[PDB]
């Protein structure tokens, strides 16, 4: 992927009136697909009386990792889904999802008309989105002894590190994650803790 990226620091909600109809775009931070799906429910729930609830998202890598998605929910194919996705791709903001909510007003508009209501809707919201940088943790592996477990968890946590997954065999096989800034400080701390016999390694297979 890439070093770091920007993500949403706060949700956004904007509304608009097109030919007596009611379009309400709602943005928000969503890391991963469950997250995206998570608030589609809330926006649907919240507006049962609205005919359509079109979606789109990126689970940001940002635009490097394609955890991209969309949906028309009854609006003419390629007219309520892709348009809003291309805005999210246009923004260059990872980990975000969008929902347009349609309340039919009695007057129907063309294929163009729908595209400017959906694509455009995500466009307006995007003008009010506040962001924040996000440097993802780096992941390494580390084989230690059981009598060093608690000790290592603690050192890890002091370096803003997180123990990803454990494997309890004859020895402990740990998959750790920590800021790439703090690796050298962690290694040093680690070596002093074990008299230089612990060996932290950088993942490779994937």
Letter string b/e over residues 155-175, b meaning 16 or more CB atoms within 10 A of that residue's CB:
bbeebebebeeeeeeeebebe
**Rg, the chain, Cα only:** 23
As beta bridge partners, residue 172 has 144, 168
Give Cβ neighbours of residue 33 (< 8 Å, ≥ 6 apart): 57, 59, 67, 69
Q: Please give the DSSP secondary-structure letter assigned to residue 206.
A: -
Question: How many angstroms separate the CA atoms of 206 and 193, rounded?
Answer: 29
As beta bridge partners, residue 13 has 26
What's the sign of the alpha-carbon dihedral 7, 13, 18, 21? positive
Q: What are the chain's domains? A: 1-135 (3.30.230.30), 136-206 (3.30.70.240)
Helix ranges restricted to H, 29-148:
33-46, 82-91, 111-126
Helices 82-91 and 111-126, axial angle in degrees (round to 10): 30
């Amino acid at each position: 992927l890439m070093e770091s990226w920007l993500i949403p620091a706060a949700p956004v909600t904007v509304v608009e009136e097109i030919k007596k109809s009611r379009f309400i775009t709602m943005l928000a931070h969503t890391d991963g697909v469950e997250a995206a799906k998570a608030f589609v429910e809330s926006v649907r729930a919240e507006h049962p009386d609205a005919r359509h609830h079109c979606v789109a998202w990126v689970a940001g890598a940002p635009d490097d990792s394609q955890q991209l998605g969309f949906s028309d929910d009854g609006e003419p194919a390629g007219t309520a889904g892709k348009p809003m996705l291309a805005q999210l791709m246009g923004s260059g903001v990872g980990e975000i999802t969008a929902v347009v909510v349609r309340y039919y007003g009695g007057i129907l508009l063309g294929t163009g008309g729908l595209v400017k209501a959906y694509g455009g809707g995500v466009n307006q919201a995007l003008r009010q989105l506040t962001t924040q940088r996000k440097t993802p943790l780096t992941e390494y592996t580390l084989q230690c002894e059981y009598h060093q477990l608690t000790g290592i968890e603690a050192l890890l946590g002091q370096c803003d590190g997180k123990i990803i997954n454990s494997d309890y065999q004859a020895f402990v096989l740990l998959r750790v994650a920590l800021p790439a800034a703090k690796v050298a400080e962690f290694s040093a701390k680690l070596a002093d803790f074990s008299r230089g016999s612990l060996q932290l390694l950088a993942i490779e297979e994937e």
